[PDB]
């Protein structure tokens, strides 16, 4: 039997993995940051309220100019908002109302969205005809889209329900790189700040660090109990934090290859739908489904503050690139911008 | 006080608001229906009765009422990660092949699917229409093949009506919260016309309950 001794080799190699990353944990991040003074109480007010959607929204994404944000919902619309004046600059009708993710291009020329229809449709905002229209539809991916993210105007990575992330080329319309290796279906995705590599999170309770060029998984990060729903890099690009159904946020390091800190409390038992970091990375913002957001001190693992404006599940959140504001969207059809 | 271009951007946003309000009034008056059930259980037969790659949309109108039917069984993943997208549906059309009682425990996994959908936290008030498909092939199959091989605890006659009523009592005894939701059960053949009438009669009670909820009467 080649088969049984092949898992004997795999179990020995995974034991070598656990021993190697056990040998690097000399002192935890709690022991390093006892000297650091805490952040104090973070109290953020609702500066804006974007009330245009008529159903549950599932995603938002900030633009790179920190003023335009897109938000997608189940009434077949994704609306681009002026965050400063609460103006709707576009309302794009969708071919399928079931949309679970949306993304904004870093150039600002494109938005992408996709859901249960298996297709990440890409919309051209800067048309000479004056209306937005479908640029390309990216099909052949056999599962619900969980997160689309642009690398530039031509590269886009998706994550699916068929346990598979894929890098696409928009002009040819064909997927160029296929990222397989996850066992349950991938739910979230986060690009690194240089966009040279990315992480994805699945229902394996496992996060995997990928590589865009060579196309193969480098590191695999375990430690969660239930399914991880959200993931986000630290702004250095050397760390990332995940969120799951455990009421735990855990952050990992790409160099140290393991856990660094767990963000949990006894009062919180519900799942985590969205994570993001601040601009300095000092505080991470987790969006829950006990209807509010918790501000976690990312170094000292303390609850800095609560963002409690929503009356349903906080489904999506994101921080601006200049770090001024936090917009949180939720299943009560309202976007709120916090500062 | 705004500038001229800020004023024109404000009136553009107000026209976008009027279009969104009009489309929401369009979408709020349409009945959404969720098809569930296993494959080869007469799902496509029911689609051809209402009419004549992840999610399949079906649009049909009947007695001045617009229906959208979402066949979602074409795409296969973990169902718990997207079944909350279908809360707020008007009704769930579940369908079970009656002639799959002997084939392979296929009736038992169909019961497990109805047990998972019917006692889900997102469908705690949704009324489930339970079609029972291929009753004629069931009635030739029960005279030759017994129904005790599906149900070891069954004791009853091998006629159509008592055995079909036994399968009805099982499927209506899957649910726990009897008070919250309603289950409408129908026996359908391949060639019958009354199924879209039965769906309409089941939808009208949900329409009455939401018309009371819109008028604050609960």
């Amino acid at each position: 039997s080649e088969l049984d001794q092949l898992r004997q080799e795999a179990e020995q190699l995974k034991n070598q993995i656990r021993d190697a990353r056990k040998a690097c944990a000399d002192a935890t991040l709690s022991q390093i940051t006892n000297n650091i003074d805490p952040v104090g109480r973070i109290q953020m007010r609702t500066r804006r309220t974007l009330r245009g959607h008529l159903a549950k929204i599932y995603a938002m994404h900030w633009g790179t100019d920190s003023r335009l944000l897109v938000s997608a919902s189940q009434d077949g619309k994704l609306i681009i908002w002026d965050s400063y004046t609460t103006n709707k600059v576009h309302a794009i009708p969708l071919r399928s109302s079931w949309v679970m993710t949306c993304a904004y291009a870093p150039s600002g020329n494109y938005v992408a969205c996709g859901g249960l229809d298996n297709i990440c449709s890409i919309y051209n905002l800067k048309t000479r005809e004056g209306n937005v229209r479908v640029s390309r539809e990216l099909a052949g991916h056999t599962g619900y889209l969980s997160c689309c993210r642009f690398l530039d105007d031509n590269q886009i990575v998706t994550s699916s329900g068929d346990t598979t992330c894929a890098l696409w080329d928009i002009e040819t319309g064909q997927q160029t790189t296929t990222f397989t290796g996850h066992t349950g279906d991938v739910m979230s995705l986060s690009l690194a700040p240089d966009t040279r590599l990315f992480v994805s999170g699945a229902c394996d309770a496992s996060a995997k660090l990928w590589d865009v060029r060579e196309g193969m998984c480098r590191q695999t990060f375990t430690g969660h109990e239930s399914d991880i729903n959200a993931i986000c890099f630290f702004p250095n690009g050397n760390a990332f934090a995940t969120g799951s159904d455990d009421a735990t946020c855990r952050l990992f390091d790409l160099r140290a290859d393991q856990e660094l800190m767990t963000y949990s409390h006894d009062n919180i038992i519900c799942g985590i739908t969205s994570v993001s970091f601040s601009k300095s990375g000092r505080l991470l913002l987790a969006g829950y489904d006990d209807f509010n957001c918790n501000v976690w001190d990312a170094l000292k693992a303390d609850r800095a503050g609560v963002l409690a404006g929503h009356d349903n599940r906080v489904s999506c959140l994101g921080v601006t690139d200049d770090g001024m504001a936090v917009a949180t969207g939720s299943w009560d059809s309202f976007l709120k911008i916090w500062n | 006080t705004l500038s001229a271009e800020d004023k024109a951007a404000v009136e553009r946003s107000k026209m976008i608001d009027r279009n969104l309000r009009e489309d929401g009034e369009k979408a709020a008056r349409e009945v959404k229906l969720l098809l569930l059930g296993a494959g080869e259980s007469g799902k496509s037969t029911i689609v051809k009765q209402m009419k004549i790659t992840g999610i399949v949309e079906t649009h049909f109108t009947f007695k001045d009422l617009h229906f959208k039917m979402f066949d979602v069984g074409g795409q296969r993943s973990e169902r718990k990660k997207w079944i909350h997208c279908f809360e707020g549906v008007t009704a769930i059309i579940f369908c079970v092949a009656l002639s799959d009682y002997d084939l392979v425990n296929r009736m038992h996994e169909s019961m497990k699917l109805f047990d998972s959908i019917c006692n889900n936290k997102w469908f705690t008030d949704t009324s489930i229409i339970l079609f029972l498909n291929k009753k004629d092939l069931f009635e030739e199959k029960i005279k030759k093949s017994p129904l005790t091989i599906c149900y070891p605890e069954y004791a009853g006659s091998n006629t159509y009506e008592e055995a079909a009523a036994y399968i009805q009592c099982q499927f209506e005894d899957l649910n726990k919260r009897k008070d919250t939701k309603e289950i409408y059960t129908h026996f359908t053949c391949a060639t019958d016309t009354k199924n879209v009438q039965f769906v309409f009669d089941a939808v009208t009670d949900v329409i009455i309950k939401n018309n009371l909820k819109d008028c604050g009467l609960f």
Partner: single-chain antibody, 231 residues
């Protein structure tokens, strides 16, 4: 895209005439439309404006009461009903599309023009009426505003246009700093409150024509008299 003017000709004074602008190739109901005229040896003069959905209509004060702008969205046609035509209404009339959201570029496309012959504002001052221009050399023109165009939101509502000889004008620089689409990066705009500069470094051929600067801070919109580039 295409905007086609029609309805000109010789009109007796005191008479009436309806001008028509037929749109083609763009989503016409999402666009605010303008009429801008040009007296046959003079500069550009703004006439009227109708917004999207016909909810906001402005006129110039020289034509207020006499002119009626109206649009018909299902057949994509812009109208200008003109009554009691005077001899100062002998001009060539352009219909202009313009859309206003965050980051939009209004006054981007202009119609070809119809020619009709009749038998407290912000004053924009072009500094020179004509400059001698050598090809290849850099040139830089300027105009000045009577009021500071820098609004409190950070925007400066200064638009630059170029009219080639015998052609419609086209947008070069919108909102003092931003290049229009299809315009080369030789053109550059710079300035401050009420003092503005359009720079054409490494001038090529077919940059030759009259250049107009326009404010869009307040209605009515006022142009300059035009700076002519001559070889």
């Amino acid at each position: 895209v295409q905007l086609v003017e029609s309805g000109g000709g010789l009109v007796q004074p005191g008479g009436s005439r309806k001008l028509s602008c037929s749109a083609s190739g763009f989503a016409f109901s999402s666009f605010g439309m303008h009429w801008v005229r040009q007296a046959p040896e003079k500069g550009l003069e703004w006439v009227a404006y109708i917004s999207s959905g016909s909810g906001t209509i402005y006129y110039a004060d020289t034509v207020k009461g006499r002119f009626t702008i109206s649009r018909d969205d299902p057949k994509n046609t812009l109208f200008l009903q003109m009554t009691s035509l005077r001899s100062e209404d002998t001009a060539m009339y352009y219909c202009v599309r313009s859309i206003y959201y965050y980051g939009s570029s209004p006054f981007d496309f202009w119609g070809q023009g119809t020619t009709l012959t009749v038998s407290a504002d912000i004053v924009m001052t072009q500094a020179t009426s004509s400059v001698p221009v050598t090809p290849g050399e850099s040139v830089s023109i300027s105009c000045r505003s009577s009021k500071s165009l820098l609004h409190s939101n950070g925007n400066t509502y200064l638009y630059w246009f170029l009219q080639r000889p015998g052609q419609s004008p086209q947008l070069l620089i919108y909102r003092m700093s931003n290049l229009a689409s299809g315009v080369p990066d030789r053109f550059s705009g710079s300035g401050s409150g009420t003092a503005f500069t359009l720079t054409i470094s490494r001038l090529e051929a077919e940059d030759v024509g009259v250049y107009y600067c326009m404010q869009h801070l307040e209605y009515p919109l006022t142009f300059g008299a035009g700076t002519k580039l001559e070889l």
